[PDB]
Design an enzyme around this catalytic site. Structure first.
Site, PDB file in Angstrom:
ATOM      1  N   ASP A 198      36.553  38.100  36.991  1.00  0.00           N
ATOM      2  CA  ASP A 198      36.360  37.502  38.308  1.00  0.00           C
ATOM      3  C   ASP A 198      34.964  37.734  38.866  1.00  0.00           C
ATOM      4  OD1 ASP A 198      39.028  36.542  38.401  1.00  0.00           O
ATOM      5  OD2 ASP A 198      39.717  38.512  39.081  1.00  0.00           O
ATOM      6  N   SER A 199      33.956  37.806  38.012  1.00  0.00           N
ATOM      7  CA  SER A 199      32.571  37.882  38.444  1.00  0.00           C
ATOM      8  C   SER A 199      31.905  36.521  38.277  1.00  0.00           C
ATOM      9  CB  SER A 199      31.820  38.950  37.653  1.00  0.00           C
ATOM     10  OG  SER A 199      30.469  39.015  38.056  1.00  0.00           O
TER      11      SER A 199
END
Ligand SMILES: [Zn+2]
Ligand SMILES: [Zn+2]
Ligand SMILES: [Zn+2]
Lengths: 49, 44, 48, 49, 64, 49, 49, 252
Positions: free
Chosen positions: G9-10
């Site tokens: 989730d970056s």
């Protein structure tokens, strides 16, 4: 009400800026009747108390 | 020490001791004038 | 280490100043801790 | 195409305009460190200064 | 608030096309036709004007 | 759903009852003393405000 | 999956786009201070010490 | 207190809250400064009596919409007077009402004794009696009131325009400067000055109206107005627009 006591309309931005409460004065018509067992009745009304 | 009135935008020199208020407007919200000192911005 | 007589408070200890400090508020007006106020009450009644 | 080498990427990448939002949570608002800081006088323990 | 100078994706100049874009729309051009008239071929640059909100116009409705 | 109005109306009656209770207490002191009471002075405006 | 820096989730952002104002924002912090004359002994005023 | 440097001005440090020798670097005191707190970055009769008096002060203030700063100033005056105990015989309500009057004077926004009385059960006579006693007890003084100290409140309460208020202020100040009303109370002059300016504008206020807000009998306004009427053209501001010409002002 200013320091001198002069009322003025309060704009919402001024309330926000000066940290005031956006409040409206509330008045009530009060009728006072007094009986002194002397077959007389005095009815005095204080408008917009 | 110039303060700009929030109502009429009048620049008026105000001392520290005297009350803060527009000289002619009577308004009670005053904004300081932008500093004369120079600040550098890199257009980045 | 413990005796029944010692349970009775004949002499009351006073906590050090470290336990109860003198807080400073509104300038130099030393705000005494709650213990000091009770200690002040204790000594007043004790003297009386 | 690979930016570093310029070679075509073997897989074809799903790319297009999407509406993104920047959230109030910034790392600068969150990063904080403590190293022999201002302890409390009464508790002799760490506190913010 | 105001039209960006450059397209974010490629750096193409977009800051001199908002007024022309509004003028073209007033000339009954469709949004796509106006963008083509302005030389915005890449959809990254078309995104710049198609999705711009000119808040500076309403910010000027408040007296300094 | 209790919206702002009904929520405010809930407060007003409690605060208005205090106002009416307060004037009753103020008037009772003067009536017992034997002297009539001033209505303006009997009302505590800070109760509602 | 470009270089592994968007995993879990970056997000990988374009630095050139950021240089052009992409998702640039302002942060306004407002500080309020009032000077109170409560207490005859103490009278706080605004002035550079 | 650097052991190497006797009598050295230690520098306070906010990093850890310690005082360091100004020229050694030696940390004297580990973390004693308490940076966070320092830099901003069953009721007694005397107490209960003060409690009730403070309640009365706030109750009076709301009646005339006084700001909390005046209320705070009044509370401080009551504490001084109450603790001094030169007015122990006087009723606390009278002391509070007199303190409220002094607080208004000390803040540059005086309210006339009648205005304070109208919000207090204490008569004006008793407020004046406690007013003078408080000044003696506190060894303080209040700057003499002027005509312009009431123009803003009076004119605003009369719904008069700003120009009328400006003219009313100018007339009252000029009349005092010219000594046209020697010995007259400033409130009487202010009411008369307001009447003259009001009669000269579209917004005209009767003598009764000004008296009610000003607390001055129409007879008193009549007397002061009669004294300044002869010099009406001189008192009015030079840049004033007369709805009714000065020569046609009411004569009485
Ligand atoms: Zn102004
Ligand atoms: Zn582009
Ligand atoms: Zn040293």
């Amino acid at each position: 009400w200013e320091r001198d006591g002069a009322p003025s309309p309060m704009m919402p931005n001024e309330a926000r800026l000066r940290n005031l409460t956006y409040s409206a004065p509330l008045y009530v018509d009060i009728t006072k009747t007094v009986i002194k067992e002397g077959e007389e009745q005095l009815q005095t009304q204080h408008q917009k108390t | 020490m110039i303060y700009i009135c929030g109502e009429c935008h009048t620049e008026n020199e105000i001392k520290s001791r005297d009350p803060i208020r527009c000289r002619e407007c009577g308004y009670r919200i005053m904004y300081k004038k932008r500093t004369k000192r120079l600040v550098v911005f890199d257009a980045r | 280490y413990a005796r029944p007589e010692w349970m009775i408070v004949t002499v009351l200890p006073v906590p050090p100043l470290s336990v109860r400090p003198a807080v400073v508020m509104q300038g130099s007006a030393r705000n005494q801790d709650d213990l000091t106020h009770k200690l002040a009450d204790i000594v007043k009644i004790n003297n009386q | 195409y690979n930016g570093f080498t310029g070679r075509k990427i073997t897989s074809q990448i799903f790319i297009g305009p999407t509406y993104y939002q920047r959230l109030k949570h910034m790392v600068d608002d969150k990063i904080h460190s403590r190293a022999r800081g201002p302890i409390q006088i009464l508790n002799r323990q760490p506190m913010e200064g | 608030m105001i039209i960006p100078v450059r397209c974010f994706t490629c750096g193409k100049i977009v800051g001199n096309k908002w007024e022309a874009y509004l003028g073209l729309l007033q000339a009954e051009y469709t949004e796509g036709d106006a963008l083509d008239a302005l030389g915005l071929k890449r959809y990254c640059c078309r995104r710049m004007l198609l999705a711009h909100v000119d808040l500076i116009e309403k910010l000027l409705n408040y007296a300094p | 759903l209790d919206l702002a109005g009904p929520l405010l109306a809930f407060l007003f009656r409690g605060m208005f009852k205090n106002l009416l209770k307060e004037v009753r207490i103020y008037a009772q002191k003067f009536i017992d003393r034997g002297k009539d009471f001033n209505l303006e002075l009997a009302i505590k405006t800070r109760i509602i405000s | 999956s470009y270089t592994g820096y968007n995993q879990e989730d970056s997000v990988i952002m374009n630095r050139s786009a950021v240089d052009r104002g992409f998702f640039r924002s302002v942060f306004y912090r407002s500080y309020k201070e009032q000077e109170s004359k409560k207490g005859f002994d103490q009278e706080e005023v605004f002035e550079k010490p | 207190t650097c052991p190497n440097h006797p009598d050295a001005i230690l520098v306070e440090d906010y990093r850890a809250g310690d005082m360091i020798c100004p020229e050694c670097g030696l940390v004297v005191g580990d973390r004693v400064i308490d940076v966070g707190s320092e830099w901003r970055t069953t009721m007694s009769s005397s107490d209960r009596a003060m409690m009730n008096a403070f309640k009365e002060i706030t109750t009076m203030a709301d009646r005339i919409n006084l700001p909390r700063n005046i209320v705070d100033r009044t509370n401080n005056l009551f504490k001084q007077v109450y603790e001094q105990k030169s007015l122990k015989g006087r009723a606390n309500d009278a002391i509070a009402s007199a303190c409220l009057y002094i607080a208004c004077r000390q803040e540059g926004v005086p309210r006339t004794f009648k205005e304070i009385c109208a919000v207090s059960r204490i008569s004006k006579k008793e407020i004046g009696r406690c007013f003078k006693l408080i000044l003696k007890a506190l060894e303080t003084s209040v700057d003499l009131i002027t005509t312009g100290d009431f123009m803003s409140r009076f004119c605003s309460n009369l719904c008069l325009p700003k120009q009328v208020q400006m003219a009313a202020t100018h007339i009252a100040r000029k009349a005092v400067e010219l000594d046209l009303v020697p010995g007259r109370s400033p409130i009487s002059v202010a009411a008369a000055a307001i009447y003259m300016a009001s009669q000269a504008s579209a917004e005209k206020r009767t003598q009764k109206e000004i008296g009610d807000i000003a607390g001055v009998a129409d007879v008193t306004i009549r007397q002061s107005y009669r004294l300044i009427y002869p010099r009406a053209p001189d008192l009015f501001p030079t840049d004033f627009k007369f709805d009714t010409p000065v020569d046609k002002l009411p004569q009485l």
